Structure 1
Amino acid sequence: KLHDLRPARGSKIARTRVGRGDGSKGKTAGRGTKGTRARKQVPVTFEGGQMPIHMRLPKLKGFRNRFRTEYEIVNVGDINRLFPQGGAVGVDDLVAKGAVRKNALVKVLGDGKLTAKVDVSAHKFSGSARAKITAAGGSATE
């Protein structure tokens, strides 16, 4: 029933109401001075006046290619451990089995020997990928 319902001991932690008497957290609540912190909060940027570590270091080299053809990869060894028999797979079958998200262009990676007889359809194979998948009997595709 409801008169027999308790959380797990470990959650439902006691809130710390600070300015509640000099026995728990008393007057200053943790900002125990008359400084700046005792009324307000100094940011993470401000460092005293000397140039912060985000102004004296240099902006990271190079640009960001607007047209970065980002793919989604699927593991040839883990495409073995996805399909033990296999024989017929393809990007839709990967997103079906839940190996990579939808709305995707796929590459197939090359960690681990794929020892299943499989043919794979997916754009943009890598070196070891095509090697292993075309040595597992099956081949690569586009």
Structure 2
Amino acid sequence: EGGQMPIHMRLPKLKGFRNRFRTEYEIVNVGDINRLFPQGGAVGVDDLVAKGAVRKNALVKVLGDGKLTAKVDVSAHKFSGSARAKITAAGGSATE
């Protein structure tokens, strides 16, 4: 920068640490579930990866964005708060 303190040196470092032990979930929404399984039925992680809604070999978490109307039987990890309510209102079940 010509000799003045550069932008990458006169600014403070971003605060905090990064968790070495953090677990990451691949997410899918009930709107996507409703779009992909109009007939309802069982909805497993293998079904999700086959339909391409989620990456393979990863932990799956279900979130609650969208409208769900089909009666489905979703098995996953770590359901959301809204996802459980929407699934049970639709009439299915959410096992872990």
> Which bracket does the TM-score occupy, shorter chain normalised?
over 0.9
Offset at residue 68 of structure 1 (A): 1.0
Distance 1:93 1:108 in 2: 14
Q: After superposition, what is the alpha-carbon deviation per residue over 1:35-91, rounded to whole angstroms, capped at 9, x for unaligned?
A: xxxxxxxxxxxx111111111111111000001111100111111001111211101
Which residue is equivalent to 1:135? 89
Q: Hey, what's the Cα distance between the residues in 1 that align with 2:9 and 2:24?
A: 31
Higher relative contact order (CA 8 A, sep 6+): 2
The CA distance in 2 between the partners of 1:135 and 1:87, in whole Å, is: 15
TM (norm. structure 1) is: 0.66
Identity of aligned residues (%): 100
**Distance in 1 between the 2:6 and 2:17 partners?**
23
Say which structure is richer in strand.
Answer: 2
SS at match of 1:92: helix
Over the aligned positions, Cα root-mean-square deviation in angstroms equals 0.8
Deviations 1:12-49 (A, max 9, x none): xxxxxxxxxxxxxxxxxxxxxxxxxxxxxxxxxxx111
**Matched length:** 96
SS at match of 1:51: coil
Whose radius of gyration is greater, 1 or 2?
1
> How many angstroms apart in 1 are the aligned matches of 2:41 and 2:91?
10
Structure 1: where are the runs of 5+ without partners? 1-46
Q: Is 1:82 matched with 2:36?
A: yes
Report the Cα distance in structure 1 between the residues aligned to 2:24 and 2:68, rounded to whole angstroms.
Answer: 24
TM alignment of 1:1-142, pairs within 5 A: 47-142=1-96
Once superposed, which parts of structure 1, at least 4 consecutive aligned residues long, lie more than 3 Å away? Answer: none
Give the C-alpha shift of residue 113 in structure 1: 2.0
Question: Match for residue 12 of structure 1?
Answer: none
